[PDB]
Design a binder for this molecule. Structure first.
Ligand SMILES: [Ca+2]
Ligand SMILES: [Ca+2]
Ligand SMILES: [Ca+2]
Ligand SMILES: [Ca+2]
Ligand SMILES: [Ca+2]
Ligand SMILES: [Ca+2]
Ligand SMILES: [Ca+2]
Ligand SMILES: [Ca+2]
Lengths: 395, 395
């Protein structure tokens, strides 16, 4: 028992270090003598059937141009990535969706202005890993308002000789969302349009290393990332050349699921600036009839406020919504949602109640559209939605 | 399909408001004309078989003494409560464990000094709810270093005529942990030892209300909370008089489980000040052989840093450790823990490796004690711990 107590106590401490050190954030610092920045970070690539392959990243960025750029105070980028496949694509490929935000500093230039909308992206990579030459082309778009990248990459030489996850960091940090109060620390956009050179060494623990040099710049209205990669000293049946790295998980939100959350987000972010402020959150809650104090509104946002900017951005909203609930918690959540829709609390959402809720949220739907929502949910043909019918629409 | 899309989009927005507004924090503001404070908060009491009973709290505190107290800027308290039963207690009772911390303001007085250790607590309550008179006595201790209360309450008049959860807020906020940078906002300790009067109105939605007046002061070295409660207009078979409120859940950490996490916490908090600083976290990680930058250490703490003080307190540590993992995540966590113990990575934790890990964590164990840990884990009698043996000790 005392021995058991000792294993538990020290087990907890060791697992606590594991939980704390689970982050894979990109730490950025100025490099004033090169008029640019350096970064360091550690990617943890899951190995098939358990374990992690560590990839230690050392990064340097220097502007192509001769002029002023923003040299930042220390801060970091936080990345959410989702890798998937196109079922209609026969070539070796990767579909990638990424959300990237800056943080670590507590509470419009010509470079900034280039990123205020959706920007087309081209990526070209020529690689040579242990003598295996290969090429990758990618295209898609970046929307820095939401820190969002959506891209599809093809191996144009045939089968990719390394796992796709090992190339993600190499294959445009100018698309990261920097909150307003960190705008003076955004080196990446400040170097645009002439662009920057991004170089890395990536050391795969107990295995080989990649050395990468990329030119990141606008060519016309397209942001282009042109990359040369060299890998050396890889083990022929290590995790990289032996393709023993997990591609993704079954347990990840779909691109279209994320898209539905983006539509929900826009109901709060009515000015489309990519943030929900206390004013905006209160506006919606007040329209639904609730009355939060400024203190409650500040605290509610603070709870999910990863970067401490006092607002909810889309990646923060996604984190909150992506969180899976205990099935008993989920039930109570749906029960509470029903209560919001059933305004008079009589156990039935009427068509009139549903029209009002749509109006209060800021949805614009015709009465006919609302009737179609009623028809979709109604099982017993009374033209109203009871609790169990509502559960089917929330499930 | 379009109708379905509409239910999903608006469902997400409504559930998002539910997730955001799930907090039950205690909002405190100064009341300068009464030389004290006011507070407002909304408790959500789970109803048996689903739903919530709301209890709207309005609070006022005024010092008993004539002298100076600290009148705070706006801030809040965050509470974790665990209600349980004593299997050896035959009377109607409640065992309560609470952790309370202050937050909401961004980065030793004689009153403060009274709370630097463990302080005995007595609680006395005389109540009268719809004419039903009853009394409650409680005793235990408070340890503000960890924001911790542990108390047991007995109904001394027989059966309690209201549910125990409805009395928790009434039955010593001087035991809240205020971080160093908020010390000038701690009204509760500043009024000690002469104490304060705490008054509330508590409105149970669609039901009756409690009016409470309490005197909170030291009597000798004991912190005493003496309370008069009056309830009126309750519904005879509403949720309160009808006893339809859930007492607790099966899914809560045990008092002794929490105690094991406290022992683990003390390995990092080697100076016993109730916080883990970047210096302390780095010290342990460096002893285990790891090398985090100051940036990594700051970021790791920030991730779990509820109050933004730059350190991990015990309730923050508990939140991190209490979080339940997907069984696949838990497996990888245990795999990674094994790797920390198996220093040379050969698949076996030797006795010598285990002795070193104990030393590196700052555990003080004899070689004999370490041998007993080996014996506890060893299934195949080689005197070492392989991975599957280790899994049995982590499970
Ligand atoms: Ca906005
Ligand atoms: Ca934010
Ligand atoms: Ca209704
Ligand atoms: Ca119906
Ligand atoms: Ca400490
Ligand atoms: Ca903290
Ligand atoms: Ca070993
Ligand atoms: Ca063994």
């Amino acid at each position: 028992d005392s021995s058991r107590r000792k294993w538990n106590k020290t087990g907890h401490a060791v697992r606590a270090i594991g939980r704390l050190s689970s982050l894979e954030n990109v730490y950025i610092k100025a490099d004033k003598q090169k008029n640019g920045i350096k970064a360091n970070f550690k990617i943890r690539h899951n190995i098939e059937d358990g374990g992690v392959q560590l990839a230690y990243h050392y990064q340097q960025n220097t502007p192509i141009g001769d002029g002023p750029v923003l040299l930042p105070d220390n801060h970091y980028l936080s990345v959410q990535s989702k890798l998937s496949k196109d079922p209609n694509e026969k070539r070796d490929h990767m579909v990638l969706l990424e959300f990237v935000t800056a943080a670590g500093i507590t509470l419009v230039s010509k470079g900034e202005e280039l990123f205020t909308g959706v920007v087309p992206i081209l990526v070209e990579l020529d690689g040579d890993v242990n003598g295996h030459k290969f090429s990758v082309s990618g295209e898609g778009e970046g929307d820095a308002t939401y820190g969002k990248l959506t891209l599809k990459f093809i191996c144009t030489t045939g089968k990719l000789p390394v796992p796709w996850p090992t190339l993600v960091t190499t294959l445009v940090q100018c698309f990261s969302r920097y909150p307003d109060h960190m705008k003076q620390h955004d080196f990446f956009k400040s170097a645009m349009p002439e662009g920057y050179i991004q170089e890395r060494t990536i050391f795969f623990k107990d295995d080989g290393n990649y050395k990468t040099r990329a030119e990141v710049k606008f060519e016309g209205d397209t942001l282009v990332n042109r990359i040369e990669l060299k890998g050396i000293d890889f083990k022929e049946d290590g995790n990289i050349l032996g393709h023993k790295l997990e591609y993704n998980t079954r347990d990840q939100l779909t691109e279209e699921q994320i898209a539905e959350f983006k539509e929900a987000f826009s109901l709060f972010d009515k000015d489309g600036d990519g943030t929900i402020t206390t004013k905006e959150l209160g506006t919606v809650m007040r329209s639904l009839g609730q009355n939060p104090t400024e203190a409650e509104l500040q605290d509610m946002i603070n709870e999910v406020d990863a970067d401490g900017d006092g607002t909810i951005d889309f990646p923060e909203f996604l984190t909150m919504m992506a969180r899976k609930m205990k099935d008993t918690d989920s039930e109570e959540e749906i029960r509470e949602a029903f209560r919001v829709f059933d305004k008079d609390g009589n156990g039935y959402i009427s068509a009139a109640e549903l029209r009002h809720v749509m109006t209060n949220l800021g949805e614009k739907l015709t009465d006919e559209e609302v009737d179609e929502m009623i028809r979709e949910a109604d099982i017993d043909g009374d033209g109203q939605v009871n609790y169990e019918e509502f559960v089917q629409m929330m499930t």
